[PDB]
Subunit: 116 residues, 4 copies
């Protein structure tokens, strides 16, 4: 459980369910390598992306597929995705929750980082 | 558990702990009557404010004491509090989570409303 | 002009036009007394609320009538209004912009305080 | 000018001054090609990025160098950068303002698209 993603919908006042999320990690040659992916649950949460063994230090990009979410609801949104790019585990393993709050022309994101 | 408040700190990347929260309900004479109060836990959550019997229809104000929070951390913030004012339980009982994300000169708030 | 209010709409990607805004000043008995008010322009702005002479230190509340805004657009909203409560302090910079970004079940607000 | 970027600082309550901003356009092979760049002004704004003739429909990415911004202020930041990815569409309004509100572990962004 070192990486969890939580997504909320600011139009509905609800969890954002069935949101696709893709995680990438920067490789030594500066390309973005696929790392993990999944879908938010009925609570708007996505657990089980990685393990503490797999989730090594690096630069990670969490791409939340907001356009796909809004289009499935019949809405034409502004953004293609919401991206969150950060260095992880640089002073040892941490647990990361990446949260996003979505509207059709806006989003907010925050991180909660805890030390187990 | 029909009303829960969750507070996050956007400077630290952490739950906002020990945040005082006061809830008021508009009375028939248009004054704000004290309704419930409490403090966020180490997870940034405040549970147990009210009961489904007590939490009747009305207009409620959730005042999150952000200035007091920032001052206890040695920071001089802009706002006195963050306030969230809404009509509750007008089409029957609902469960409400009021969330706030705090910075010294800014805040965001959202509501998650679910039907049990 | 020491106080400006800016309102944006996160659903339509636009300024929030013709939004009623009321400013109150906290009185000695802790009641809120009306101070200034108006409606946002086509750019989502409300200028001319007060003057340097009038805008003394104290606690002010800016109430933005978001419920009426959303209903006039045909959208069901959560909040009754958004309110921003702050202290004006002469030791800090002299122009205050209160900005708000509105969604039906959420809002964001920030202060930009400059000289 | 069809594209403007506005950056605000939620810790200091100010414009985010001298922030590097890079705009990229998605190429046919899905790579990001540099399109425009600059540094925000004293008002937190970056004007003059492109012209109507240059700013054709397509997918664009605006990368805001928030990590450098925070470090120059002595504050420890979470993100490497903030990036805003969107499609320019000629069927919608013609001026795009991309606004971002920065905190060390969070950011908010909105689009204001007007004629
Ligand atoms: C208790 C720790 S947890 O990880 O399990 N809970 C938790 C984590 C993240 C958030 C983010 C909330 C939130 C709320 C609003 C209004 C926002 O604009 C944004 C950007 C975020 C909330 C709770
Ligand atoms: C009037 C058009 S303009 O472009 O010249 N002015 C303008 C443009 C964008 C903004 C964005 C504001 C803002 C405020 C808050 C609190 C936010 O969270 C975010 C994400 C954005 C404000 C004013």
């Amino acid at each position: 459980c070192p990486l969890m993603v939580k997504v909320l919908d600011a139009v509905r006042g609800s969890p954002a369910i069935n949101v696709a999320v893709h995680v990438f990690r920067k490789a030594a040659d500066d390309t973005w390598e696929p790392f993990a992916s999944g879908k938010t649950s009925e609570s708007g949460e996505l657990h089980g992306l990685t393990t503490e063994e797999e989730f090594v230090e690096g630069i990670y990009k969490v791409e939340i597929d907001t356009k796909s979410y809004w289009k499935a609801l019949g809405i034409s949104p502004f953004h293609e995705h919401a991206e969150v790019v950060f260095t992880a585990n640089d002073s040892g393993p941490r647990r990361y929750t990446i949260a996003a709050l979505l509207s059709p022309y806006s989003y907010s994101t925050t991180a909660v980082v805890t030390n187990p």
